Amino acid sequence: KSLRDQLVESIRNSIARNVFFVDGGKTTFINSVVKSLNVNIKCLPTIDPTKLPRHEPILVTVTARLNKMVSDKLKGYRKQKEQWQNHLAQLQRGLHLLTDKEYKPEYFSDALKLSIGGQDLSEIFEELVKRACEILDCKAILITFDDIDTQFDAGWDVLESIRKFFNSRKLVVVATGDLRLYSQLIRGKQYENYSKTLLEQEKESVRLAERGYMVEHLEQQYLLKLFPVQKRIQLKTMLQLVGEKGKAGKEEIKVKTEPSMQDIDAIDVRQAIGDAVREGLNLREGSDADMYVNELLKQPVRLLMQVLQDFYTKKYHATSSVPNLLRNALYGSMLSNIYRAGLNYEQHRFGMDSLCKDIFTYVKQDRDFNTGFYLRPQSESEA
Amino acid sequence: KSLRDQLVESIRNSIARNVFFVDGGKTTFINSVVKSLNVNIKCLPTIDPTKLPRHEPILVTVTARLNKMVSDKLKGYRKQKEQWQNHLAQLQRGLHLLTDKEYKPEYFSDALKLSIGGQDLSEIFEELVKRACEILDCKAILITFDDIDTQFDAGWDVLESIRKFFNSRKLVVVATGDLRLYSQLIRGKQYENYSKTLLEQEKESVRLAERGYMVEHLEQQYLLKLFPVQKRIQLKTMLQLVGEKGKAGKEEIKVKTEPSMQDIDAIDVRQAIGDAVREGLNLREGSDADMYVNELLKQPVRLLMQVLQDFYTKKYHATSSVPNLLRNALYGSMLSNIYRAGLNYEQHRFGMDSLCKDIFTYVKQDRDFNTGFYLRPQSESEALRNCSIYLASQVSENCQGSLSKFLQMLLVGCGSVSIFNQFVTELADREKFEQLISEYVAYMSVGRIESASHWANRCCAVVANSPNDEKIGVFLGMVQLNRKSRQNMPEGYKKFNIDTENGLAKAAMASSLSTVASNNLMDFCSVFNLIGAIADISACRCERSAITNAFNKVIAQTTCIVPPWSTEFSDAITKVEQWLKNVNEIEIGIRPSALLIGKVWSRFYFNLNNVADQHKTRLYRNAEHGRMASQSNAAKIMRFNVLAFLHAVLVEESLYHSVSDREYIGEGLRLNPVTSVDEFEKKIKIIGEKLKADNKTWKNTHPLFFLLISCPILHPFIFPIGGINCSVKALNKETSFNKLIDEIVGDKLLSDEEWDYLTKIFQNTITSLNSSTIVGASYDKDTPAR
Amino acid sequence: LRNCSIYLASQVSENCQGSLSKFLQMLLVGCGSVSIFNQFVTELADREKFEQLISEYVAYMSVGRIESASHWANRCCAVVANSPNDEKIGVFLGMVQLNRKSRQNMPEGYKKFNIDTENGLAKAAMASSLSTVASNNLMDFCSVFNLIGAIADISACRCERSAITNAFNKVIAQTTCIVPPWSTEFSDAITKVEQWLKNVNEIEIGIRPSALLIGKVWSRFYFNLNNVADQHKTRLYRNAEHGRMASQSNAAKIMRFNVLAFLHAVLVEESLYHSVSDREYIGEGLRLNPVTSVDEFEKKIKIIGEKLKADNKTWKNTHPLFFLLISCPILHPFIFPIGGINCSVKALNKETSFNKLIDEIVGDKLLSDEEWDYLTKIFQNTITSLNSSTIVGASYDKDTPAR
């Protein structure tokens, strides 16, 4: 929340690249920022790439949303209009280029028809932004982009749209995601700019090496230019948002455990999770549980919310064992991890025999072999 | 600035290939030159292939731009226009040649319609530019081409246009980037000149050899013609524009840090970077900070500027820690560096746990294993050199104001590598090498550190798992005493019985104790184990009870396995807890730098090598009572081990702790007390006299050394039974040393009666280890006479 | 490669022009390191194995990323030590493994080497020559290679008197280095050294060292070291100390002759190749390496000096590199050691003329006449303990043959 506020101030005191990034839910924070923005800058409905069609330009997407916004602000209460239609028509005409798998020469006369020469869709875009600012009495336009977690390849489309078109002084953009993926994307198409035959021929370690160093150097230089460090938001985690062991608690949350919870019975967050772990673990209130739950809170907020909202939910239902309901939650929470582990998938083969081999396998992958049966959250692998 | 100036003169005095290249903001320089020309030549709008459609001819792009210029110069104020359109139409209809993926016969007649014969758009272009000059009233025109870093495959087409159209007299070309990439481009592009079948047929090494050799021959053959060297631009760097170490400074720049600086408060560039590095890293203004800042200036202007424009701005925001704010900037600045490094990306998983394994990992890609804990950018890897800086910043961030966290770092990050390279490198091939390091990490739980005593007790087994040459249980900083007290052996030498010790000394050596469970379950005694216990107990809290709990846990005999490749304490508790109440309040100013802790570990580890070499051949049947320097016992060995520890502490802290702006150790041959304490005592005397003269305390300066001598768990070891040199020349120095200890600590550690007893029930001192028999030591011969 | 070689030669010259310390650093690091890899390091080397070996080699000496000539000296001393066979005589290519543990019941007055028995400008030079390897048994070797690395380190730091003392400590102090993983009381010496600096920093401006001359110097001097080592593994007799006739040798003679071979190659190649001069004053003679004597080197000196005087040439104008090398205060002590000076009537007369020639070239008398007569029969600037310094491995069972 305060993260959203701070970032809002950062964006506002920016108009006096132009991309702010959100590290990581993230969607919730971004929407909160959007609403907070509603120093005159005009915002637009979010841009969720992963739920946008495969082949269209983020350029056309933004152009259409701008069309809607301007049409509304113009249909309310023209000379702005025809000129805007003019800009829009040139945009559409010199827009084939993006799709075009080949150059027909016929566009040679299109590029010759009468401040750098040509039909630069970027300059058309910049003049469109100028027109929008003038019409809307805004200092700039904010653009938004949702995470590409479900589809991380299209996001490079946003990257390219930025590099070609949002290098304008009237536009600021907000990207969000985990920069690991962005790194693959940069790399992901870095190596394709190589020739296949060359990679075919020089598969010697040395040559592989210099190619990798060049590619990753270039990637680092592109990522920095795209996302200045200051312009990206660090974002607090839930665990940093709650007391580490009681010596903290910056902006507590509080959660509701049973239906009534009239805002005064809301059973903590840390305390509720500690209760759940202790009781579903036959665990007692020692320091061991505290560490288990600290390494339980850092987990993705959606993961924790589902795991602790299916626990107390089924507990309320059962009230009209605690741990059995508890690992009922764990099946759905970490099942992907366990199934990746290759261990028991079927629920009806639980028994006592299967559990022995379950721990036996888990220790074979965490190595250990000395206290792995401790099952302590000690692995580097989050799986 | 002088760069592009000389550039402009060079272009102007060229009309009287015509390709010029700027090696590399590169675009900033090129565009600045662009405006510089605004010898009459017409400049052309900058051309970035990456800002251009994936399928376009630079020919068409240039043609359209030429169109705008000729037209508007002509819409200003006719015969030129229509003939120009004649040239334009000739271009256009001959243009398909560029695009067409096939040859259609219908164009043969088109080529059959009318100065060399044919439909060469090259010439078409040259008379085009001829007419353009005719109109524009310039002796020639410059074409510009932007860096292709974002998509370097585009520049290839510009290249063909180079060979194909820019082979004209009235043309000057300007290109930007890193010619290494262009080399990459052409090297591949030639490969498509080959028949694939050829390639999968003659794939024998010699054949590949001549094939490459020809390829590189052609590569250079091209690059010469495209980019004659006389026309290539050097592009001096910032380090080439800023004083290297003060004997330079050609036209210093000055950049802003806070909002105001009305053109006078601009704090240098070198000076500002030195500030950022030193105070964001606890680096002092020694000789390293400059080299680091130079290795910070060597990086591209954008990265350096952004990292030096973010740090100070967020300083301003926060002020309305320097080490943490500094690591913040480096985090993004080298994220891709780090990300490819596979290092901790989870900002929520930074801690001090991930830090130590981060140091270890870096010390595996950098190789080293000798001073990699120094973390200085010594590696060629331009990604590792800056990861080193970021990791140093993070270590300082973690250790800000934390005595026991500093202890934990020095132990885990530093000694883990020291023990590996000298003790775990005899096993490891490459894949087997990373495996071995993996199980090494697993045994130590490095990065996933449990406790300092845990790491020490693992290190004790590691140390035991190798040394030979008389098989003496007297290692770097440990003494392998006999537990099974059944060995026909002389005088009063015996096993170690902890029950014979009392108060704050029994627990002290029981904590320095190490009882590994290899199979023999040998009980080791190591300065490493005792240091781990001290680090464990030195930042628990101010509580009286949990202090007792940790007291027991550390003193409780804890048993560990070898790596798979081989009522009576309420007084000591009060004393230790008073030492903690001192430490937790005087440590808030500790600002150890990664280099500081690297030096401390290096010096103490090697002093341990010295004390391990020099003390093995000193074990005699009468070596007990340690009166001379030729008499050795487990007690004296461990006392000298702790002495090396504290001497390295004081020396490196006086030398390199960021809180200290000048040296009080003195300019001399810093040597170590190995069989005598003369070095340590003399250095202490000089440091104390310097502190008195400059009106400073051992708390203001040398607070870490102060607290380390102030540890109640260490005091019994300083003057143990059998380890105090009773020679008169030795006695006076040891007496002065005891006086210095009492003065610095502010308290008299040992009573006069205790001191005289030793120098001829004793709590606060070791009384059993002198007669404690060390396994392996023959104790056959006696000390030589004379 | 035909062009890479020329580029490298151009770079080396461009770097080393007018810079004596830079000449030394390059001459050593780029050339002698390669030779060492060849003769001693090639004994392990598959092609991937060889590349791993070369990578480990370069990582060890920080070749390309050298910290200091003294640092590479400490590393290369251990590198050299990690091999020698054939009676395991502690006198290597250009260095000698000193016995650091003086518990060895050996004859006459032979003992360990104590730096405490030595004082001032000789104590410090010998301590810097000391090579304290961190191998395992902690064998403190001594190399003329170690010393020359020290000279390279200290030759072009700056003119500051105090930084002279700092570097003096850093170099002469015990230097520790592990084996590669494949096996006050100096206030006068400091003044002399800084005066030598105040001369060198100003007479070194004309040196134009070529890569060819650099390589040839190493080629002659390394083989001279080879021969000075081969000829003297079987002359360490119980009476071999005192170095009176040509048939008695000791560690002091070893050090003197290693330094002498260094400077002999220096003079020969300077007269032969240095671009500063258009002619060779060495002469059309059978240029030989003085191994068990100084006769060849002294004949060369006399001829070169006489022709310099005939041609109106000074040893600063010609042989400036060699001039400054001979002028080095630290090289002075090894020139006329105790027990390393051949006292034969004919040997004595050539040694005396050699002393006089060196003195005239330098422009100052290194040794007092009492020092000279004592050597021929508290002596600062002179090594006095290495004569009785027992060499690890030398049996010292036999003595000089009679007749």
Numbering used by the authors:
A (entry chain M): 35 to 50, 69 to 76, 81 to 94, 102 to 140, 147 to 183, 190 to 395, 412 to 474
B (entry chain S): 35 to 50, 69 to 76, 81 to 94, 102 to 140, 147 to 183, 190 to 395, 412 to 519, 524 to 661, ...
C (entry chain R): 475 to 519, 524 to 661, 704 to 897, 909 to 934
The paper states:
The RADAR system comprises two genes, rdrA that encodes a protein with an ATPase domain, and rdrB, encoding a predicted adenosine deaminase domain protein. Here, we determine cryo-EM structures of the RADAR defense complex, revealing RdrA as a heptameric, two-layered AAA+ ATPase and RdrB as a dodecameric, hollow complex with twelve surface-exposed deaminase active sites. RdrA and RdrB join to form a giant assembly up to 10 MDa, with RdrA docked as a funnel over the RdrB active site. Our results define ATP mononucleotide deamination as a determinant of RADAR immunity and reveal supramolecular assembly of a nucleotide-modifying machine as a mechanism of anti-phage defense.
We analyzed mixed samples of purified E. coli RdrA and RdrB by negative-stain EM and observed gigantic flower-like arrangements with a central hub surrounded by up to six “petals”. Further analysis with cryo-EM confirmed specific RdrA-RdrB co-complex formation and allowed us to determine a 6.7 Å structure of a representative single-petal complex. In the RdrA-RdrB complex, RdrA is positioned such that the central heptameric channel funnels directly into the catalytic core of RdrB. In agreement with negative-stain EM analysis of multi-petal complexes, the RdrA heptamer footprint sits primarily over a single RdrB protomer and leaves room for a total of 12 docked RdrA complexes on the RdrB core dodecameric shell. Nearly all contacts between RdrA and RdrB are mediated by residues that reside in an RdrA α-helical insertion that forms a crown on top of the AAA+ ATPase domain. We introduced several mutations predicted to disrupt the formation of the RdrA-RdrB complex, including charge-swap mutations of conserved residues in the RdrA crown (K150E, E151K, and R162E) and observed that mutations to residues involved in RdrA-RdrB complex formation significantly decrease or ablate RADAR defense. Modeling of a complete ∼10 MDa flower-like RdrA-RdrB complex demonstrates that the RdrB adenosine deaminase active site remains solvent-accessible, suggesting that supramolecular assembly could represent that active state of the RADAR defense complex. Instead, we observed that the addition of RdrA to RdrB leads to enhanced conversion of ATP to ITP supporting that activation of RdrA in vivo likely leads to induction of RdrB activity.
